[PDB]
Amino acid sequence: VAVVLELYGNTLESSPVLQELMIDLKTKVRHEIHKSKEAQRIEGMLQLLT
């Protein structure tokens, strides 16, 4: 998705359809960074408990 938004930036400007796909992809990235951050916290507390 990084190389497709690198190569299709002006079509993102013109076309309205995949803008909501980019929007909820932003939400999916935020959901996944929240999940991986709390999993990193669990990795930290296991490094405490060892």
Partner: protein, 94 residues
């Protein structure tokens, strides 16, 4: 998350027992492997968020700048202007 709360609260309520257990990582080697598999890919998903936020924010401010036709447009194409003038000989005969 709805059982990441479960996998943390067992640690929080009981920690000292499995600390005093002399072999932690040998029998807990699956869980922290799963969590490091979950957590080792942070930097390029930060890169994903950076480039995606850049592109969609640039598109959003440009669309907010140049979205000035959101009430009534796409005129000068009318079926009523075509109405019976596009016949122009059915009305001449009839």
């Amino acid at each position: 998350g709805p059982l990441n709360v479960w996998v943390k609260w067992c640690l929080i309520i009981h920690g000292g027992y499995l600390v005093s257990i002399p072999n932690l990582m040998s029998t807990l080697s699956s869980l922290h492997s799963t969590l490091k598999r979950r957590s080792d890919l942070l930097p390029r998903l930060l890169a994903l968020d950076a480039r995606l936020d850049c592109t969609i924010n640039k598109f959003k401010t440009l669309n907010y700048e140049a979205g000035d036709i959101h009430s009534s447009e796409p005129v000068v194409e009318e079926d009523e202007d075509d109405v019976e003038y596009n016949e122009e000989l059915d009305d001449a005969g009839l």
